[PDB]
Structure 1
Amino acid sequence: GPVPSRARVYTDVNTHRPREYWDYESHVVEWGNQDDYQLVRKLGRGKYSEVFEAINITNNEKVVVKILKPVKKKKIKREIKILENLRGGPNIITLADIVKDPVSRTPALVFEHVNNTDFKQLYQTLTDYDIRFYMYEILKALDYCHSMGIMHRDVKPHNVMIDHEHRKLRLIDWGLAEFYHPGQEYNVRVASRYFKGPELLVDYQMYDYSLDMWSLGCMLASMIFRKEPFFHGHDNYDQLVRIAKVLGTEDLYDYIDKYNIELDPRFNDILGRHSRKRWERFVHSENQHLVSPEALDFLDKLLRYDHQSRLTAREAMEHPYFYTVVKD
């Protein structure tokens, strides 16, 4: 059987929290007044929800309403409880209210509005300084939720809303987030393909906060190398092959051997043998102004096969890459 694993930090946060904190199935939802919110326009539709811009008519302020699609009451309460637990934390999207939508017959989550630039165009314009700045801001959010016993499990550009005018950032869509409990096995069908950690791709279920750090590394690679997404797999199998062509196959085998994991035999014909590459090979004249020795070392320390070897969010904030970022 597989070798067990533990987070190297915040391991027992939920253990010593009162049960009410992590037992979301028992959570009793406090409902606001649905008539306070008037929908203005549809912003997007996902697998699990529709998202609208709206107005709070009690203060005439813009808000965002997320009307959940019919899914397990467990998952609905999970997202709600996690959002309430994390409310007020650094760069955590603020849940302002919860109402019953009369048409969908489901909960509608009301969020603070973020006046964002969509990640397609913004990533085109981010400077070296901007990338360091916003990475640091994401780390504040990740160290906070990890310190609060929660892993996000869907870190990707879409879920990092940035108001570039006020240089404000919010980590959104906590619909896949979970409470970390030592020894617990989790669903590996989380995160978007390009941001899935090697643990997910090799079906290792006893993972932890460090999953988010792989995803963050994928985002960083895409920003400093100007290639979005960086690991661009055609499916979940090809995704691991794409990673192995960069990190190499010998360290992949070291990883699965450490946890006594077996690869899907379908990899036998597609994985091949690959040396580990040096990050400098991805540098060229159109991205070099975004690359520094500090950037490459930081990236290198996020993108490890072994989830136990990755920088923690707090360790990441100590990295020399962020020395040039103004703190106040």
Structure 2
Amino acid sequence: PLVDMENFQKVEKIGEGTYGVVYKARNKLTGEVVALKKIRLDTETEGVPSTAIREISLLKELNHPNIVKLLDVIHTENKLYLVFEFLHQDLKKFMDASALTGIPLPLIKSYLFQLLQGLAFCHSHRVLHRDLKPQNLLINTEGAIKLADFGLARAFGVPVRTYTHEVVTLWYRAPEILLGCKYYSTAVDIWSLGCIFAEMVTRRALFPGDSEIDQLFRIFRTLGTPDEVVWPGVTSMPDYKPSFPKWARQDFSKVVPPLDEDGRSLLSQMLHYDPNKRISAKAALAHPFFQDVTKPVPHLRL
């Protein structure tokens, strides 16, 4: 266990949070570059956190080019280290660095294609990610993008119930969840990806809400206040209110102006109100929008 830690040379701190720290590091014997995620255990002495349990157990089932590889787990008496492959940057910072130029449309298309492939793999393996946001999407110089951070991920051979606390950040949260539905479905991950597709295209967040009710009204104001025809059941749902403003759907070509007809179609289906009607990752991969997809490399301002 401690033999293993001494074979790593810490290079620099590349990430930090309530979860702990992430170091870039090198294997001194093999030369392998690596990301070490360090979780302190003495902070609650409640044992291994649920968030590590799910990330470790689920990630080691998932081997796919667009899902971050977990390389190893090292468990000492007070520290837990997860060893991951290293990638140069995340989508949030890259979008930010691309503000003046924009992300070229062919790179946007490649990224969405890759993200869907990774998500399809997750879902066909009964894993829900549940926290897809630009900061958990990692990229390298060769042009790949990968789903990362599976601390909130959940196996769903049995249906997964809604927690108030353990949720996607507000801007990427599906309407079903806001409206108080009972179970998560795969549809909630596709909703998140659709929001991110739009943000890459426009250079602004699609639905930057201030609160739960504000997030909803921003969705309603863009996509139209849903009704029983659009979405059977909506008016029954727990947190639905008859006093809701009834907004008309905005012209979709004015929401994502840079997109062609194929792009508009794909995003419509990714943002369908009814979770059962919302397109699946596997079916999205077949959409004509990906007819011509290629694999460009990003200008990483590293």
- TM-score range for the pair, normalised by the shorter chain length: 0.7 to 0.9
Question: Which residue in the other structure is 1:112 paired with?
Answer: 85
Shift of the 190–32 alpha-carbon distance from structure 1 to 2, 3 Å rule, reads farther
Listed as ranges, the gaps of 5+ residues in structure 1 are 1-29
Residue type at the aligned position of 2:67: I
Shift of the 141–65 alpha-carbon distance from structure 1 to 2, 3 Å rule, reads same
Question: Which residue in the other structure is 1:305 paired with?
Answer: 273
1:99 aligns with 2:99: no
Deviation at 1:170, TM superposition (A): 1.6
Residue type at the aligned position of 1:100: H
Once residues 252 and 212 of structure 1 are traced to their aligned partners in structure 2, the CA distance between those partners, rounded to angstroms, is: 23
Once residues 252 and 305 of structure 1 are traced to their aligned partners in structure 2, the CA distance between those partners, rounded to angstroms, is: 11
Contact 1:244/1:252, CA 8 A, preserved across alignment: no
Question: Which residue in the other structure is 2:171 paired with?
Answer: 194
Once residues 321 and 48 of structure 1 are traced to their aligned partners in structure 2, the CA distance between those partners, rounded to angstroms, is: 38
Once residues 275 and 311 of structure 1 are traced to their aligned partners in structure 2, the CA distance between those partners, rounded to angstroms, is: 22
Task: Give matches, 1:248-287, under 5 Å.
Answer: 248-251=224-227, 255=231, 257-258=233-234, 260-263=236-239, 268=243, 271-284=244-257
Contact 1:31/1:98, CA 8 A, preserved across alignment: no
Once residues 229 and 135 of structure 2 are traced to their aligned partners in structure 1, the CA distance between those partners, rounded to angstroms, is: 32
Q: 1:235 aligns with which of 211, 214, 238?
A: 211
Shift of the 44–147 alpha-carbon distance from structure 1 to 2, 3 Å rule, reads same
Question: Which residue in the other structure is 2:181 paired with?
Answer: 204
User: Which has the higher mean CA deviation after the structures are superposed, 47-56 or 90-99?
Assistant: 47-56
Question: Which residue in the other structure is 1:11 paired with?
Answer: none
Once residues 256 and 49 of structure 1 are traced to their aligned partners in structure 2, the CA distance between those partners, rounded to angstroms, is: 43
User: Which has the higher mean CA deviation after the structures are superposed, 183-192 or 315-324?
Assistant: 183-192
Contact 1:153/1:177, CA 8 A, preserved across alignment: yes
Residue type at the aligned position of 1:296: R
Once residues 194 and 253 of structure 1 are traced to their aligned partners in structure 2, the CA distance between those partners, rounded to angstroms, is: 26
Higher helix fraction: Structure 1 or Structure 2? 1
Deviation at 1:223, TM superposition (A): 1.4
1:314 aligns with 2:282: yes
What TM-score do the two structures reach when normalised by structure 2?
0.86
Question: Which residue in the other structure is 1:169 paired with?
Answer: 145
Contact 1:51/1:64, CA 8 A, preserved across alignment: yes
Once residues 50 and 2 of structure 2 are traced to their aligned partners in structure 1, the CA distance between those partners, rounded to angstroms, is: 17
Superposed CA RMSD in Å reads: 2.5
Q: 2:130 aligns with which of 140, 144, 153?
A: 153
Deviation at 1:260, TM superposition (A): 3.1
Task: Using the aligned pairs only, state the percent identity.
Answer: 30
Listed as ranges, the gaps of 5+ residues in structure 2 are 296-302
Shift of the 260–272 alpha-carbon distance from structure 1 to 2, 3 Å rule, reads closer
Contact 1:187/1:205, CA 8 A, preserved across alignment: no
Shift of the 99–312 alpha-carbon distance from structure 1 to 2, 3 Å rule, reads same
Deviation at 1:45, TM superposition (A): 1.7
What TM-score do the two structures reach when normalised by structure 1?
0.79
Question: Which residue in the other structure is 2:57 paired with?
Answer: 81
Contact 1:92/1:170, CA 8 A, preserved across alignment: yes
